[PDB]
Amino acid sequence: XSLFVMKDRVILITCGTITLLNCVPLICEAVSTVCGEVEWVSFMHKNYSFPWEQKGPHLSMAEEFKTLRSHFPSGQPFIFGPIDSDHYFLYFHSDVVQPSCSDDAQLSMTMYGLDRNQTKHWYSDKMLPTGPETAVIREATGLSEVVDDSWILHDLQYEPCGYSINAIRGSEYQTIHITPEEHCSFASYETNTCALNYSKCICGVLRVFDPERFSVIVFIDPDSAVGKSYHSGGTIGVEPEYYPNYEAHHRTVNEYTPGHWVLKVNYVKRA
Amino acid sequence: TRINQQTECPSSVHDLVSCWGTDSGLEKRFELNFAQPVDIGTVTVKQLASVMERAGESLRQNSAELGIHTLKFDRSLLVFTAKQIVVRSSVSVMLHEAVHPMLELMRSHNIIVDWASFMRVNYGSPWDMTSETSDIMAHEYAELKSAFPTGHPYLAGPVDRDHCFYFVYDGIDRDPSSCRRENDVQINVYMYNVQEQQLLVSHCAGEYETLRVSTHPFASFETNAVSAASDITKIVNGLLKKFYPERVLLVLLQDRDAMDRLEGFTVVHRGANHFGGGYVFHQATYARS
Amino acid sequence: KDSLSLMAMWGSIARFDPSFEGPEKRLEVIMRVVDGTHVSGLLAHDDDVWQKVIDAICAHIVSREFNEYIRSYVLSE
Numbered sequence: 001x002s003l004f005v006m007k008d009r010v011i012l013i014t015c016g017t018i019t020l021l022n023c024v025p026l027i028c029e030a031v032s033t034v035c036g037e038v039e040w041v042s043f044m045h046k047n048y049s050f051p052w053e054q055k056g057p058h059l060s061m062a063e064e065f066k067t068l069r070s071h072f073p074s075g076q077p078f079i080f081g082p083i084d085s086d087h088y089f090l091y092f093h094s095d096v097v098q099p100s101c102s103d104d105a106q107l108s109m110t111m112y113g114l115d116r117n118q119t120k121h122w123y124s125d126k127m128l129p130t131g132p133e134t135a136v137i138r139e140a141t142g143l144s145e146v147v148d149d150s151w152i153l154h155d156l157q158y159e160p161c162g163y164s165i166n167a168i169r170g171s172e173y174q175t176i177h178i179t180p181e182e183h184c185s186f187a188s189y190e191t192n193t194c195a196l197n198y199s200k201c202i203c204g205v206l207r208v209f210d211p212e213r214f215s216v217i218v219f220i221d222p223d224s225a226v227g228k229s230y231h232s233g234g235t236i237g238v239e240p241e242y243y244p245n246y247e248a249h250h251r252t253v254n255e256y257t258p259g260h261w262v263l264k265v266n267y268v269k270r271a
Numbered sequence: 272t273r274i275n276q277q278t279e280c281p282s283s284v285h286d287l288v289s290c291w292g293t294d295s296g297l298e299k300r301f302e303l304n305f306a307q308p309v310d311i312g313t314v315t316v317k318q319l320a321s322v323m324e325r326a327g328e329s330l331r332q333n334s335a336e337l338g339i340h341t342l343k344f345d346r347s348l349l350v351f352t353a354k355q356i357v358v359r360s361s362v363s364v365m366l367h368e369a370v371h372p373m374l375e376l377m378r379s380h381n382i383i384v385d386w387a388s389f390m391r392v393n394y395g396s397p398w399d400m401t402s403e404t405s406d407i408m409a410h411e412y413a414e415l416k417s418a419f420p421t422g423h424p425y426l427a428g429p430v431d432r433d434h435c436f437y438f439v440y441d442g443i444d445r446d447p448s449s450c451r452r453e454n455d456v457q458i459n460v461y462m463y464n465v466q467e468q469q470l471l472v473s474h475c476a477g478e479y480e481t482l483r484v485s486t487h488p489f490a491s492f493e494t495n496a497v498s499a500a501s502d503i504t505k506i507v508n509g510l511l512k513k514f515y516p517e518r519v520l521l522v523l524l525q526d527r528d529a530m531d532r533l534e535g536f537t538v539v540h541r542g543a544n545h546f547g548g549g550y551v552f553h554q555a556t557y558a559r560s
Numbered sequence: 561k562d563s564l565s566l567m568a569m570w571g572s573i574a575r576f577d578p579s580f581e582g583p584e585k586r587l588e589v590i591m592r593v594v595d596g597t598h599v600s601g602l603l604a605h606d607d608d609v610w611q612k613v614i615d616a617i618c619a620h621i622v623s624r625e626f627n628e629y630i631r632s633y634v635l636s637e
């Protein structure tokens with residue numbers, strides 16, 4: 001995958017073996033033509049399921065770090081969570097000369113072991129763009145509940161399997177990506193919606209997939225709605241109470257740069 | 272310059288290290304906890320001594336105090352209480368070579384280790400390939416994941432800056448009918464480039480304050496006293512004045528059953544690791560203004 | 561390879577059953593605005609500009625929607 005170009009930024013999401021970093025020199029040119037200046041660059045990826053198959057600068061996190069360092073020397077790398085279990089890798093570079101107001105939001109989910117009754121619908125013997133056939137898949141699976149009529153969306157059912165969908169409503173976006181192979185089930189969700197509490201947003205996604213385990217990561221900005229909520233002891237929708245059938249396995253809290261925080265939690269279904 | 276070699280999966284973490292894989296740490300820490308408190312005299316000094324010989328350390332001094340046994344080696348300090356064995360050493364000490372022998376010693380005494388940690392504080396970054404830091408950490412991970420398949424490694428802080436790489440095994444029995452409680456207190460203060468000795472100071476039975484000072488100079492403080500938890504702000508300040516370092520790393524344990532600014536020091540990083548077992552490991556790195 | 565990626569691998573081997581890579585890579589570049597910066601920002605570009613970006617990673621655009629605030633592209637391998 002997904003590309004989201006906005007008035008002031010770029011968000012490029014990819015899966016598989018695509019070498020996402022090769023387009024950085026071009027993104028810098030894209031910012032220069034409009035006479036802007038890069039002030040914030042973040043590269044992040046959930047730990048790979050098959051790291052031995054990743055190509056180019058992505059075969060190891062030392063390669064991703066070396067590469068990103070060649071272009072953004074000031075940046076810093078982090079690893080949140082268990083390194084031999086579910087975790088995230090972050091490389092963050094910032095050249096904020098002029099203090100500004102940060103009210104953005106970023107909610108990301110990664111899910112595994114998808115409901116087998118659901119993986120049935122993400123299969124197809126033909127490539128299908130947004131069409132009535134996909135509408136049959138959004139109703140049949142529960143995606144219509146996550147992406148209601150108030151969103152502009154375009155989706156793609158792959159052959160033989162795989163489902164991607166993008167949605168935009170005003171300045172908010174929403175992206176779902178699905179790998180339904182039974183042996184390596186996976187589904188991903190990311191949105192930048194303002195919400196004092198993500199519980200309903202998250203559970204909405206979980207009902208679709210009901211995965212054996214999932215990881216949620218939240219980026220909290222200091223001047224956002226959920227930013228004020230979090231920084232005043234209020235719940236933000238990721239606390240374990242909202243997930244009775246899930247047991248929280250490991251959680252992480254990090255002020256990765258002054259004023260900005262990230263929360264990651266790993267959940268695992270019970271018995 | 273990259274082709275696909277169809278290769279076997281390593282059966283054990285040891286096959287992965289050798290098949291698919293100077294030291295720049297500042298200090299290594301190895302801790303064991305137990306399901307039931309251990310008699311202080313049950314584990315002799317000779318047995319603990321012979322377990323550190325496996326990591327190339329010769330006992331030099333040892334004192335016996337109330338609820339504590341202190342063993343001083345050339346490059347390491349070992350505290351032994353009824354609750355925990357905690358050994359801190361310099362990086363030239365391959366402390367991972369003592370993990371398994373220590374576990375066997377526990378087994379011979381029918382002592383069940385239900386919680387354990389291996390921690391190393393790094394000034395540098397492992398991905399510096401002009402240093403052996405990475406290969407050492409791969410060997411450390413082999414001995415630990417071999418001994419604690421359920422254990423896990425975590426990395427707190429920026430990888431390219433002052434940070435902690437620690438490995439935690441958590442096998443605590445938390446059935447409601449269990450009597451194993453977690454009110455432990457742990458406070459570690461690491462001080463880089465202070466402006467050589469190993470010491471233990473005991474004010475109460477089973478509680479201690481250890482201080483290590485060794486070579487870039489640095490000083491390493493640790494305490495497990497319930498009193499220390501009450502006034503962390505007081506003790507760190509008193510430490511920074513006596514030493515006056517350039518950078519500082521704090522680690523604060525908030526256990527299950529139970530640091531925003533420092534003087535002349537700006538925050539570089541801070542964050543916590545909430546473990547599933549309810550306890551939290553808080554960390555913050557500071558640099559002088 | 562490095563010891564951290566080595567650990568991350570052992571945790572993927574212990575969960576490997578005889579496969580497509582689902583977990584994604586996320587790149588986000590936010591730009592500063594100065595006097596003289598296009599009032600349309602990065603939206604001043606045409607789809608030609610972003611097609612060449614995606615080509616740099618060897619992918620292609622299948623469909624596109626947009627509005628007054630954001631441009632969206634579904635990509636394919």
Ligand SMILES: Cc1cc(Nc2cc(Br)cc(Br)c2)nc(N)[nH+]1
Nearest residue numbers: 162163177178179180580636637
């Ligand atoms: C064999 C195959 C291909 C495939 N294609 C694909 C590509 C992108 Br980019 C994004 C997404 Br979501 C799915 N997906 C699966 N599960 N299996």
